[PDB]
Symmetry: C2
Amino acid sequence: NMADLSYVNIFTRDIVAMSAFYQQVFGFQEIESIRSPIFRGLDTGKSCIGFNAHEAYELMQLAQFSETSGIKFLLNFDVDTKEAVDKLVPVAIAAGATLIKAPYETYYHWYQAVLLDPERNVFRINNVL
Amino acid sequence: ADLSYVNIFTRDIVAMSAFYQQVFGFQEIESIRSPIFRGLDTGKSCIGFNAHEAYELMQLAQFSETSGIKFLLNFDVDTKEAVDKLVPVAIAAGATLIKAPYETYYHWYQAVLLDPERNVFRINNVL
């Protein structure tokens, strides 16, 4: 491929707690080789999820956008069954997630739940019917 | 679990999907297309573009007003030169260069840009 979406990075206040949250809920393994004082990466089997500390804003000349509110993206996680979605929801909430929408079937026939992670980023636990 | 998609809430799903296709060559996923959604195949996690109606559908309306940026998409290319050549391709497609191609202390050659709707992405090469 001409270009590879190797990482989806989330700017976070606590990369250790954020990494721990996604590991706890989905079991992704950390990628120790890419670890740094301001970064944590998890292997998802596809695009990796990265967590960057706030130092990352100034480092990339993005300080002007460091004041954030609302949500503009979401991570969609697929599981093998509808039952797996029902089971993972409480696990996520116990880990610090906030339930926005209980498991339901979408117009495009996907069974999913909509939640917020500990730092209020949106993610879905989904199953393609 | 599988990170199948990373969705970006957008004002113009057509313009946005076209931008990423024009810069990286991702092919559209027809089977997931809808009046409020466009999906692109990247070889790994897909990139989705959701029109604003998606906020209400997921009961996220109270979060529709946003500020700043909280994520970025990192695209790796095969060579150092690929980074230098792709920056003008992105700008021609409508991007804004924020940080010109440079080498980090851990030897990654990259550039930071904004897509047409002010979402951040990087063109990177591991030296």
